[PDB]
Amino acid sequence: MRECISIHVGQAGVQIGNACWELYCLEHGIQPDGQMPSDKGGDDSFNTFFSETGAGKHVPRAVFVDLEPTVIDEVRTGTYRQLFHPEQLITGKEDAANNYARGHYTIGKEIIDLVLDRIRKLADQCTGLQGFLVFHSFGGGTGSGFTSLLMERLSVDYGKKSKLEFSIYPAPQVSTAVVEPYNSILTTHTTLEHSDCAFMVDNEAIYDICRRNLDIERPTYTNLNRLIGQIVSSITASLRFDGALNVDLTEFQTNLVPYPRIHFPLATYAPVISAEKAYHEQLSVAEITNACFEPANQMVKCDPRHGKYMACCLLYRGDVVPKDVNAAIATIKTKRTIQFVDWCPTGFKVGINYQPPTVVPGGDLAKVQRAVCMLSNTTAIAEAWARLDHKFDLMYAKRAFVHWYVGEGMEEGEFSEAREDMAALEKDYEEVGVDS
Amino acid sequence: MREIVHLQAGQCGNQIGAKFWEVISDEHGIDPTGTYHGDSDLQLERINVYYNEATGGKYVPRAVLVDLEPGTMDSVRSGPFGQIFRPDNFVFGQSGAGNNWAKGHYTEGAELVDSVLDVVRKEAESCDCLQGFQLTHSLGGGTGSGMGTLLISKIREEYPDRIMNTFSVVPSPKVSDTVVEPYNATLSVHQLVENTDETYCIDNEALYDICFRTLKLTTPTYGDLNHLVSATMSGVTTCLRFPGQLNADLRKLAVNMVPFPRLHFFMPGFAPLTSRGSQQYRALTVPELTQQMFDAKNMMAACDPRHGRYLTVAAVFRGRMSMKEVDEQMLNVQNKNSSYFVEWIPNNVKTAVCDIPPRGLKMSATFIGNSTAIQELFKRISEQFTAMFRRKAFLHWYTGEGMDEMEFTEAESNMNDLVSEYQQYQ
Ligand SMILES: Nc1nc2c(ncn2[C@@H]2O[C@H](COP(=O)(O)OP(=O)(O)OP(=O)(O)O)[C@@H](O)[C@H]2O)c(=O)[nH]1
Ligand SMILES: Nc1nc2c(ncn2[C@@H]2O[C@H](COP(=O)(O)OP(=O)(O)O)[C@@H](O)[C@H]2O)c(=O)[nH]1
Ligand SMILES: [Mg+2]
């Protein structure tokens, strides 16, 4: 009944996919063959992410899309090669090459009808589709440009359905490409107009948590992507397990987005800890909530003390009881460091779910009795954009790469157009924070 | 899916190209017979990039070998791997160019073009999705300089949208190999600026410096120098042919490297390089790898970065390493050395990490630098050209081939604009 469709775009999307679907298989007891041995029926919990074949083989409701065959071919060949349906792993021949115009205007149009055709088949299998979960990077040509095209098309075919959007935003300082500002700014329109709720994370924040909370000196993408998977598991837990106070995706959106234009929450997850440190701490309900409001534990390099909270969604898992959630929230409301906007006097949505977190073998996290995932809509996010407008204005003042984009069938008026869209959005975020 | 066609022009082109095919056959595990003996199933997954398949499990290079006189190619065929090349891909004249760019460009080489273009069509049209073309040559010569630029100008009309890369040896700052060297080099650069997407400026006199100062070799032969160049050549393509955590093909690099369409001359480098004795004193780490990669002594070009500003940089790391440590190191170098990077590009370095190091080595990197210091190369050539041309010292060898003297003044003006184009960003 309550299905979700996952869409994994580009190298970042595909490689996050590997971490997500490893987790979901283990969380439901599905082997990498797709067999469940515990069917000695009456378990529906898998049905959000998997569909059952009459042979007893469970097939992900996923689509993986890339304009290059290198990242997908590993999936076609590794441990999970039997899990995915062969036609869900769509691939092209040549990457957008970090150029948004290739992903959007020239290369993307070659493969888009295959992706849209496959999404029909998955949506027809559903009977109560909650929405689409999209994973991509801002900085890439395929993640930026092809996703831009894809969500504009999905908006026409499925205008009612929620599109949620997890994305890798560029870090403040570390970077991997030089054209990273142009793609990011040009992306903004589709996150502004075609996404119902967008969660941004940047890699420089997550490198920080893996160093001071997991004691890992040299984390790779495999460590980061495992943290992202735990967030998505928690948002969808109330679709999959029993709980005292289950939150649906529709109900989740109603309590975070106060205006249609203002839909950019920060994600945070707690506790993140090594098992060597979990030995010296009690992970009580109060303790884990305080850790969600620390600036050092945010997944974007922005400081919430420089802005105002509009609304917060707290999702708790495991050995948690309402008596202590009430005690924890009451404490937070007393701290003058944490300032809510005056026009939002009841700033919390709470969810409690009985199933505790699973842990992947050989992963970094501890086995824990309980956890909390927090989603928070805050005026402090506007500083992350201003810090990236600067890089765009700096380069663009002298056309530094524009011939690459205009030669691929863009026209240069989009550069100022997109930069003005970002200006308008930043001006809205600063004024909605003003007290009445 | 991303096939490369390899071109070899002239004496230096063939001697380098022969070494390149030995180097990458060792990575893929191809015997001199042309048959596969590699241990890893990952070695054949992308072998299509450089080789065609043949019946019986034999692989042949997608290479075409060109010379105006066969003498050098006979030495190539007498070598150990010289049997792997398809015999129909040797294209040879019967009269040398004489180090005269006009002979190679208008008189001798113009009669040979059609034979080469038939081989290029037949190789290129076999590809499922051609990535582009790759030429090895020298600018100081007659066949490399003259006909190499003729070929480039023709195939870029037949295939405008494909990538065009030149690995080109350029004349060195203080000992010439050829008396007429600066005419050939000046006329040839005038062809490159119009018709190439990337150019890598190798200089033989920098390679002697690396062999002496870093490798401590007492008797380096051109077999050693051509090995260094081939390691650079294979490093740039590795992400097309092995899996990695951040893939990066030729086009992705060019997009991130060339801000304006003329500014496409790059300085290569390779790391690690160590002598036999020092091997025991190293500490194999990404930092130590990064330190040598930016060292001015390690550049394969006779231009010094300290005299200019980097526009853009690429590092293609090979080996299983932590992404955080790489991202950390490339930020750290930019923050300290703020004077050596242009102000108006916020991040100058492109990174790409592959999983498979070369055999017998833990980690490796290939460096590409686009630097305003490259004007130093063209400006010292420009002065020598002017010193000769005002006295018309050797023009009768070129005008007797029907060349027009206006074409010499044109090449000055185009090369002098190019040095001005770089200067404005110093
Ligand atoms: N967190 C995380 N970021 C990743 C991962 N892989 C790539 N990235 C980020 O993605 C960006 C690079 O662009 P890609 O996502 O690789 O690009 P793409 O969507 O494949 O498109 P093309 O560049 O056209 O090939 C950088 O910000 C990387 O740090 C990953 O596994 N995890
Ligand atoms: N690095 C390197 N340089 C070479 C090699 N062979 C020749 N050269 C240089 O390239 C130039 C000679 O090229 P040349 O023989 O004239 O090419 P041609 O046009 O075919 O005649 C000189 O500067 C030589 O020093 C080689 O094997 N390696
Ligand atoms: Mg990619």
Residue numbers in the entry:
A (entry chain A): 1 to 40, 44 to 439
B (entry chain B): 1 to 426
Text from the published report:
Microtubules are highly conserved polymers composed of α- and β-tubulin heterodimers. In all cilia, microtubules are arranged into an axoneme, an axial structure consisting of nine microtubule doublets. Tubulin heterodimers are polymerized into protofilaments that are radially interlinked within the microtubule doublets and lengthened longitudinally at the cilia tip. TUBB4B therefore fulfils a unique role in ciliogenesis and is essential for the formation of multiple motile cilia in the respiratory epithelium.
In order to understand why, we undertook a structural approach, reprocessing cryo-electron microscopy (cryo-EM) data of the human microtubule doublet isolated from the axonemes of airway multiciliated cells to determine a structure of the tubulin heterodimer to 2.8-Å resolution. Within this reconstruction, we could assign both α- and β-tubulin isotypes, based on their sidechain density. After evaluating each residue of the candidate β-tubulin isotypes, we determined TUBB4B to be the best fit to the density map and thus likely the predominant isotype incorporated into airway cilia axonemes in vivo. Thus, structural analysis further confirmed that TUBB4B is a cilia-specific tubulin, despite the expression of many other β-tubulin isotypes within this cell type. The site of mutation in the TUBB4B variants associated with the three different phenotypic classes of disease (SND-only, PCD-only or PCD+SND) were differentially distributed across the structure of the protein, both within and between tubulin heterodimers. The PCD-only group (p.P259L/S, p.F242_R251dup) variants localized to the intradimer interface, the interface between each α- and β-subunit of a tubulin heterodimer and have not been reported to be associated with human disease. The previously reported SND-only TUBB4B variants p.R391H and p.R391C localized to the interface between adjacent tubulin heterodimers. The PCD+SND syndromic variant (p.P358S) was located within the intralumenal face of the tubulin heterodimer- the side facing into the microtubule lumen- close to binding site of the anti-tumor drug taxol. Our combined analysis showed that different TUBB4B mutations disrupt distinct molecular surfaces of β-tubulin, which in turn disturb different aspects of tubulin function and result in different ciliopathic disease phenotypes.
